[PDB]
Amino acid sequence: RSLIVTTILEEPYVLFKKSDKPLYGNDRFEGYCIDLLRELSTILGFTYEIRLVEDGKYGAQDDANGQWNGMVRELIDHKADLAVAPLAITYVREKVIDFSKPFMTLGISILYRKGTPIDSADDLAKQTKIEYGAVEDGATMTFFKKSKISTYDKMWAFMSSRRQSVLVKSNEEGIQRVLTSDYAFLMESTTIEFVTQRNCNLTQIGGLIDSKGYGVGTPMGSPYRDKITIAILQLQEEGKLHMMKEKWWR
Ligand SMILES: N[C@@H](C[C@]1(C(=O)O)C[C@H]2OC[C@@H](O)[C@@H](O)[C@H]2O1)C(=O)O
Numbered sequence: 001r002s003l004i005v006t007t008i009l010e011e012p013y014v015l016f017k018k019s020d021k022p023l024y025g026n027d028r029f030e031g032y033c034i035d036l037l038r039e040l041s042t043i044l045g046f047t048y049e050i051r052l053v054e055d056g057k058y059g060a061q062d063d064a065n066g067q068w069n070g071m072v073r074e075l076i077d078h079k080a081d082l083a084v085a086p087l088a089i090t091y092v093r094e095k096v097i098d099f100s101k102p103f104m105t106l107g108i109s110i111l112y113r114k115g116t117p118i119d120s121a122d123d124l125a126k127q128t129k130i131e132y133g134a135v136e137d138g139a140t141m142t143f144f145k146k147s148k149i150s151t152y153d154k155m156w157a158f159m160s161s162r163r164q165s166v167l168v169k170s171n172e173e174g175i176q177r178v179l180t181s182d183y184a185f186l187m188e189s190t191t192i193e194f195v196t197q198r199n200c201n202l203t204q205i206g207g208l209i210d211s212k213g214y215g216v217g218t219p220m221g222s223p224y225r226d227k228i229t230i231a232i233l234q235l236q237e238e239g240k241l242h243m244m245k246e247k248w249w250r
Pocket residue numbers: 010058059086087088089134135137138139140141170171186187188189191
């Protein structure tokens with residue numbers, strides 16, 4: 001029937017739409033990814049319902065029991081037909097789900113307060129006073145966990161040794177720690193752009209640590225993946241994706 005689309009709350013990609021009049025169905029949400037989903041639905045001819053991922057996670061594999069979680073696991077378990085969210089396309093996820101071509105490109109970087117001598121991941125990694133970390137079970141944490149690059153392997157050893165104290169459960173928690181304590185938050189450049197424009201005391205530190213894209217996730221072998229890619233390429237070529245980014249970041 002209608003497709004079930006899982007997502008996760010992350011400003012400005014997906015928000016609860018605030019309104020005085022009761023809101024119903026898909027109108028309860030808004031954001032760049034909500035606009036994307038709508039365009040996908042009219043281009044390809046489907047109807048849908050939005051569900052918030054139940055365990056509140058993007059998706060990582062638990063290496064004690066091999067189990068994936070988050071939106072990734074919902075796709076694996078066929079609890080959702082699509083995942084439409086700021087969902088990073090990654091090699092490890094590609095082994096268990098499929099992605100469309102990217103609708104946005106980005107990289108990991110560092111969010112920290114302005115007016116300090118910290119300039120690079122290296123400045124963070126070579127010291128143990130300033131804490132740093134990422135959202136638990138997200139692709140940024142997983143990048144550090146998998147890295148063979150010495151600066152990032154060292155950073156992961158640090159984060160992992162202090163996991164409960166330095167990994168946070170959300171973007172908002174990470175940002176609040178930066179605003180209030182001696183903390184640097186590893187996060188994606190697209191989201192950094194949004195945050196720094198609204199918190200004038202915050203800044204990106206250094207450049208991009210990797211390069212990746214966000215894509216729409218599907219269960220592996222889904223006939224929707226290639227169709228979604230065709231729709232995304234059309235929105236890109238016509239300038240619609242760029243217009244949506246302007247709408248939600250400006
Ligand atoms: N986009 C990530 C999830 C996450 C991240 O790991 O960087 C968590 C949350 O962290 C802050 C900022 O990167 C935001 O875009 C979110 O992205 C993913 O697909 O898992």
